[PDB]
Every structure is written in C-alpha cells, then in structure tokens.
Amino acid sequence: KLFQASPSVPAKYVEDKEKMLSRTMQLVELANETWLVTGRHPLPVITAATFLAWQSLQPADRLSCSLARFCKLANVDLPYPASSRLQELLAVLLRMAEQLAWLRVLRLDKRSVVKHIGDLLQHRQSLVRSAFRDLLLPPCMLKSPKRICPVPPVSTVTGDENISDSEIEQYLRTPQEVRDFQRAQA
Amino acid sequence: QPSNVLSMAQLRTLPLADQIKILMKNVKVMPFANLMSLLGPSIDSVAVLRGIQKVAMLVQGNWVVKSDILYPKDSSSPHSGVPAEVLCRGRD
Amino acid sequence: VSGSGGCNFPEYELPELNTRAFHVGAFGELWRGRLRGAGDLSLREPAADSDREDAAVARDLDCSLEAAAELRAVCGLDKLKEVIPENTDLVTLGVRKRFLEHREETITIDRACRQETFVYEMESHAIGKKPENSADMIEEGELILSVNILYPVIFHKHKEHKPYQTMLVLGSQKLTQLRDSIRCVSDLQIGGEFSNTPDQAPEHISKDLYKSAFFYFEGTFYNDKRYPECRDLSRTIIEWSESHDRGYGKFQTARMEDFTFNDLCIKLGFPYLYCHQGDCEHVIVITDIRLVHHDDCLDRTLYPLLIKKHWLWTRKCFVCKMYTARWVTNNDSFAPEDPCFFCDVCFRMLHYDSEGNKLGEFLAYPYVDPGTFN
Amino acid sequence: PYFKDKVTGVGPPANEDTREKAAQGIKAFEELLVTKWKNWEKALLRKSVVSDRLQRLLQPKLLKLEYLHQKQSKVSSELERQALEKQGREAEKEIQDINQLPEEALLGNRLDSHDWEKISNINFEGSRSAEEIRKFWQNSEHPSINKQEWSREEEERLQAIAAAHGHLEWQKIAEELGTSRSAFQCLQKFQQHNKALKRKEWTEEEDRMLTQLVQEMRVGSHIPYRRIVYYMEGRDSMQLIYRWTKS
Amino acid sequence: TPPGLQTDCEALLSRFQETDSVRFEDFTELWRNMKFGTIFCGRMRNLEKNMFTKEALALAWRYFLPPYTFQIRVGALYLLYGLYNTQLCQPKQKIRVALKDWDEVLKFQQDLVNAQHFDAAYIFRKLRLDRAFHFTAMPKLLSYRM
C-alpha cells in the first residue's frame, strides 16, 4: 500500500508504483541470474528485492527502517528466510560495487550500498560477468570443501556364510534382563 | 446537525481572508467600495485592505485578483494544457 | 460545558510528577473559604499592649497569660547567636568551609552570579509596589498561578532543559492578557523580500498579520475571537482528530475572551498547548497555584511580570563580528555561506555600490534576532 | 523533553496559517541555523565529489562500450570485427588511463559544474543543504587553498586593496591579494585584526541613551553590553566595558 | 533537597525524640546547648543564602507530616518557627505549605483544644499571627523537563 497515501503510512514512505516495480523486476532478474532463487522460495527473494528498491528510491529517510518495520508498515506477513535473502543480495551488490571503480574506491558496505543500487543495475551485465569470472552455493558448502564426498573403504568381507554364535548370544536377552523388563512394564 | 459552489451565507460564515479570496476568485474585478459594501459595514476597512492586498493588485484604481490565485501550481490551461506558470506570466 | 467533576484537593496520580484533574475557580473559592485571610495588609505594628492581648486570649481558648508571658520572652532574638561559624560540632559547616575554600581558590570577589542577580531583581520588582489608581488594588485571596513556557528549540537539550521564560498570572483576569503578554519572537518576526528596497520600512509584522492563536487545555480549544482577522485552525485539528477512530474523544471549543483562568480545568505539572501563527507552538506547564500576599505584587496592572527570563545569545554579523546581525541573505554570491547574516552597515557596504544599486543577485530578509526582548 | 503535545507527530495536519507562513517567506530562525562541520563530513564530501566526477566521466564510456558490445553481438561480419575489437581495446585503455590518473586532478577546479542537490540527498541524507555544500567545497574544501596562517604580510596590503574596492566586490579583493586564499578568510582575518571605526568620543547624547537602556532593560547589576552595542554601531566590547563601568 | 540541612534536621529530630514530649524547657535547653538555629547569613552570595534558607524551610515543612509522635512533629514545627522568627535574610522567606496541610493543622489545633499539651497551641498561634505560611500544591517545584 505504498502507492496511495493512506492515513497510517505518511507521505514519505509513499513511492512511485512503476519505478519501484521496475526496480524490483531488475533486482529479481539479478537474483535469478546470480543463482539466488534456484532451490529457495521465490517470495522471500521478491520481498527482499522490493524492500531494497523501496530503500534505494530514498536512502535518506529509510536508512534506519528495518525489515520487520517495513513488513509491519505494509501489513504483510514477514517471511522467515527473507532476511537471509536480503543479506545475500546485499553481498552480491557489494561484489558488484567492488567490481565498479568509484564504488570500490568509496569502500561502501551493506548499509551504504543501498544508495548506489540503482547505479549497480545500470550496467549489471558486465558486473555479474566479472563477478562470476572471479557460482552461488549455500554457506554450508562454501566453507573450503577440501574432501568432497570422501570415498568410503569398500568392505565386502563376507566370510564363508556367517561369523560365530557369540554375537547371537550377546544379542539374545538374558533371563535377568527379561525379568527386569517384565517388572518395569508390569 | 464551478468556483461559486459556496453561497453568500456560506461565504460570510468563513473568515475575512477566505471571504476576500473567494470574492476575488469569483469576480476578479471589483472596486474597494463595492468589496466593503458586499462584506458589510461592521468589518474594518484596514482589515479588508490587508486581506485584499495579499490576493489582489491595484490596476487604475481598481483591484484585480492575482494570477496564482486563479491558477494554482497544480492546475493547467483548460484549452492548451500549458503549465500554470506560463498562464500567470501572461496574465501579469 | 461544565467542568470535570473532581475534588478540589489535588490528589496525586504519578510519583512526584503531577496530580489529577481539578478546577481552578472552585479551588480558589475553597481556599479562601477555609480561612479568614485579612492579613495581606502589612499592619502588624509600627502604650497599652497587655490588655489588648489579654482580651485576644480571652476570645482564644486559653484566656490566660500563664504560658504566653513565658513563651513570648523565650522566643526572642537577644538569646540568639558576623561571628565566624566555627568552634561547634556541626555537619553542614564542613560543606560550608569546603565551599568557602573552593570560592577562595578561583572565585574572586562577589560576582559572576548573573542568573542569581537576575532572579534577585525580578523577585524584588514585585515587593510592595502600589498601584497608580486606588481601584487597581488586588483583593485578598486572588489566585496567582506560575506557568512555565517552552517555545524555542535554540537552547540546550543537554543541560536538564532550561529553555524559556516563566510567567505569573491572576485567576480573575482573562486568558487574553496572558496571550498578549507572552513575548514570542515570532510576533516580532517580519516576512517579505526586501533586497531591491532595503530602506523600505517593514510593515505588517507577523503579530498584526497572523492573529490566529488558540490554547489547548485538557481537550478544550480556546480560540481568540477578539479580532475580525482571526482564523480557526482548531477546525482542521478537530477534522483530523475525528476523521479516524484514533482513540481521541470529542473535544469542546470555546472562546478566549469568555473563559478565564478560574474556569479552566488543569493538572499541575501536565503539558498543555498554546499554538499561534500556524506552527508556533508553546508547551505550557502550569506548575504552582498560590494566593496573593502583601509581599507579592499588589498591583493588578503589572502582575504578568516574569519571575524568570532565560538568557539568549544574539547572532553576530558574520562579516565584522562586532555588531548583532539584522539581515539574513540566501543564494548570495558575495556572502561566504548560504545561511549568512549581516548587520546594517556591513550589508549596505557589501551588497550595494557607492550609489546604492543592488550588486549581485541574492535574497535578503529582515533577520529579527531572537535576542530582541532582553 | 518533547514539544509535540497536541500533535504527537503521526498525522500533524498542515493548516492554512502554516501554509501561509511557509509561502510568505517568514523564516524566523529555524532553517537559517548552522552546525559546525566535522572531519568525517569533510571526508564524505571529498569522496562523494570524487565519485560523482568519476561516474560522470565513465558513464559515456560505459555506454560506448555497451554500444560496441551490441555491435559485436549483432554484426556477423568478420572484416569489421577486427575494427570493433580495436575500438573496444582503445576504450579499455582509455578507462585504464582514467583510473590510473592520480587523485589530484579528479577533484575539479574552484568553480565547476556539479549536482549539489543529488550529492547531498544521496550521501549526506539531506542533513547538509546543497548551497552549504557548494560553499564549503568552493572556499573551504579545496587542495589549492593556502592553509598557512597570515604571515603578518597580508593585512597591510588588504587594508588598502579593500579600501580601494570599497568592499563592493567579493572575488576582486582576493584576486588582488594574490595569496591563493578565499575572500571570506581574508576579510575575516583583516576585520579581526583591525579595530572598530570609533564612532565618537564621550557624546552626552549617547551616554544618556545608554543610561536609558540601563534603566529600561537592565536587571540588577549585570549590564548586557552586547545589547548596548547592538543599538550603537562602531564600538568594541572591552573598551566599552572599561569605559561605561566608571564615571 | 538540601543534603546537609536534611542531616541536621534529622539529628535535631532525634534529639527531640529523646527530650521531653512537648515541654518548652527542653526546647530552650536544645537552643542553649546545640543552638539549632545554627547558620543563617555567614558570608555568601545573597541569592545563595536566600535559596539556602528557602530549601531549609521547604524541607522542614515537608518533614512536618502527620505520622510521627508528639516529639518529632513538635520538634519539626518549632524548628520551622525558630528559623522563621530568627530570619537573618532580608526577605522573610515564607514557609512552603500544601493545600490539605491547612486542614491537617486545623485538625491538629482541634486536637490541642481537646488535649492539654500546653504551650503548643500558643507557639503555633504566634506563628500563624506572624503570617509565615504560604501554601501550594507540592512541597517543591515540579516540571516535566527533567
């Protein structure tokens, strides 16, 4: 409801519909091309993209606004992984800023790159190309996987047909344990 | 419990500044004596002068409403669609 | 509209913060009723003396001098301790000597007590002053209300908040007198562009133009209707408050020339509003309600004389730094900064040539410095 | 403390008196306030100006590179592909030289065209006005300004140069001084070094005016000497204090 | 509140707690041995001394509340009486009082009438005739800015 000025939401939060929709479309296309929506729920990524668009259209008054605050203002159920998607998308935007010259000199962060997100989307093609030159995978897999799928030792030792009866006896329940179980479950 | 939607009684029930503003927006040409007669003798002449000097200009002894009062900033020409600033400049 | 039904006694609601709602006129009426007064005249004494007090005690409960003659002799000054306060087992005297040593360290003689002397003189201004006319004598038991006001932002939000002046008002007098007595800088402020005509005398100051003003006490809107150029912003306020169910109940509207301080229903220590000139808002804090006394100002004409006045720093001319600024310039190339300030001589000699022509393009306005009243 | 008793701040309506005050031009003391500049603010201003200049220089080159890429992806000819690759490498070398240029010339001259409002609302979050930023960059944030204090060899020249100019112009005084400084600093130091004009000497009328001031606006023993000076141009604080305190 | 003056008043109240109930002989003995009218002027800034005495009287009357025995209450009230009667400040600083405190002291006067704690009604009546009491709603000044 950030299109029409309603009594609750002030005019500062109200933003243009077409420009914000275009910004969200560009952000979600970036997420789809950077392996962010594949395997994960799309709606949290959409929420993160529209939140980033709403913050970038006016970074000044919305630097202190949080994801939960935005969800409360917009009357929308906050998705749980939306925060993680937002963090990953901001990391991708930081990588794009590092690829760019003036931004990498400015040394922005996950809080100051919101004002230059629009510039990041101007020539995002070469930026993403270079970023892939220097794959998006879950954080649990990018922790230096030195031993990928370790080969287990093949153990096909079968003997003749069995081993012995000692294991059978140690599996069989003793009369003492039988009586104890009967007393317990009486 | 057009711009002439408010009647004479509804006009008089409004403050003097709003009364003068609406009268100027409606007529756009009226002498000070006529304005005093329409507003009433119980209203002070200095008050009416202060009210009219902010929404009207003096042209050959008569009072003409300002251009911005007739053409707000968000309005436009009903015939050509040009912005209200150009209309105000032309009227001035 | 009748007042809120409540006891005259100001029962507390929050610990050491404020009391509950109560009336003012009934408060003063009950205050005068529960005692006889007749003591605000300073006629104690400038011969037969024993018989008069004998008759007095005869009307009193004891009708005897047995205790009187001894206690009046005991309670004297000839048996009372100038001399250096020492040679006695004390507690506060240690702090006193420490303060004396700290004073002898850096404080020189008797001075640097600016605010102290200010308070002293502003309190002495109301000591035993008689009215010019005999009909202006304040009657005994008149309500005196101390009211702090917080209009400005230009002060220290750090220093425990000492922003602005404090006033004294009389109950029987009208609220319009307090409205006109509040010395607001915005009243002296003048609007309009005078870059091309700097010598033109600024006419129709904001005080004369923007006559709209209204108080707000406990949901009651007092709008001034003394002048035919006063609008009603309380109309828009009520429209906003009623357009949505925001929890605010219906608010009453009244006139400022018909309701006095007595008819008000206030809470001592609770903030109320005084809004004029559209956005010029004053936070009104009525702190104390007291009766008149012979030591206080007995002249009804000049009682809104403040008991406290906050010092304000004037904005000096940015060029010479020797005179207080009187003009503010925006979009000025010759000015060093955008929010710039100049005095008369500097502005004339900088922004105008030897003949007075406007050198360069800029926007100049009459800068009414906040330090104009003092 | 709070100053929002009636309107908490969620739906404060802009009434007719408020909009009339805003439209007339009565700016009492609110927007004219000035806050002292900070070191991190200076660094942010410099970084923002450098980034804006670099971005405005690179955007045409980035668009040209995009056009070259579109030509490569759309033209199937091999003869012109060599020329396309040569032009692309030329553009890459141009970008490399632009990035390799030292951080001394990318700041711009003293009076250059920029987007002050854009820089302010992007970096400073609107805290610093565009005009204030422009002034700060034009006379207080340039590497060509001489930060060295006056070496007692500028006041004697300026007291004649500004006198000849009649204080009618801003840049000419500094240009004639020729010490590579700003006219603001020059005039400030000159008027801090010099004394007041010394209006008159023991005028009975002015003494009686001061007596009337001490009788009408004085409280106790302290005397508002600044209030005294406000109604009397051509004086200085210390001499006025030492003189009026006696006799 | 005045710290050192609070401690002094508490010590004087303890001494009155060990003295006789309401007998003025012990009050005279206290004024002789310790001289509870310790300091009024000394040598200090005029307003500093004025506010010193003002806070003294305000805190003393604030301590003068119903609950205590006939020793503590009388001691506080007549410490106030002595501080007011020996006023060495040029203005005679009025003792700060509450609204319902007037009805409270009226009930105290009624109790004295239906009792025989002599010389107490006398000193209180003399204090009343001296025009010392100035009543308010709070024993101190309060705002919302703190």
Add this chain to the structure above:
Amino acid sequence: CVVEENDPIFERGSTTTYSSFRKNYYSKPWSNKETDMFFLAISMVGTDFSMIGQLFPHRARIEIKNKFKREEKTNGWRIDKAFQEKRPFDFDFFAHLLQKVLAEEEKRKQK
C-alpha cells in the same frame, strides 16, 4: 454473551498469505552428561524405544529415536561399544540419577 473476554486481532491481510511447512516439532538439544546417560540407557536396554521413552519422562520418544538415528549415522563406533558393554537394569539408582539430572537442569536454568 462475550463480556470483553477476547481481543480483536489485526491479522490475515486480505491480499495474500504464504506457507510455513514447520509447525510443532521444535525439539530441544541434548548435553554431554545427558548423552552419556543416554548411551548408558542404550547399553542397559538395547534399541526398544518404548522402554527408553518410559524411563525418560522429560524427553520425547520421537526425539530419542531421532538421536539414535543420528548416532547410528555419525558415531557408529560409540554404538558398537555401547552394545558390547552391558549393565543390569537398575531402577532405584536410575530414579536417583533422574533426580540428579532434574537438579542439574534446574541449576542450568538458574545460571
């Protein structure tokens, strides 16, 4: 009639809603001493989860099964050693150890 017994809820935005897929399970992690006594119970009983759940009142049988599956998938040698060692079933001392574990978790909550 409902005499102001409940409060209205400003939920269920008519626009749209999403899914959760995770509602109730919300297990609670184990500890070192708890894992030790769990291995002791395994060595004392076996793999029958009914008895293990009966003797463990504060931990659910489903959580016990999940822990056993995790141990079988990760630490096989520990399970082998537990099955190798054996202990006769004790009831009074087991209840005493349960009380000790209750005291230990109370102290943990205090910390």
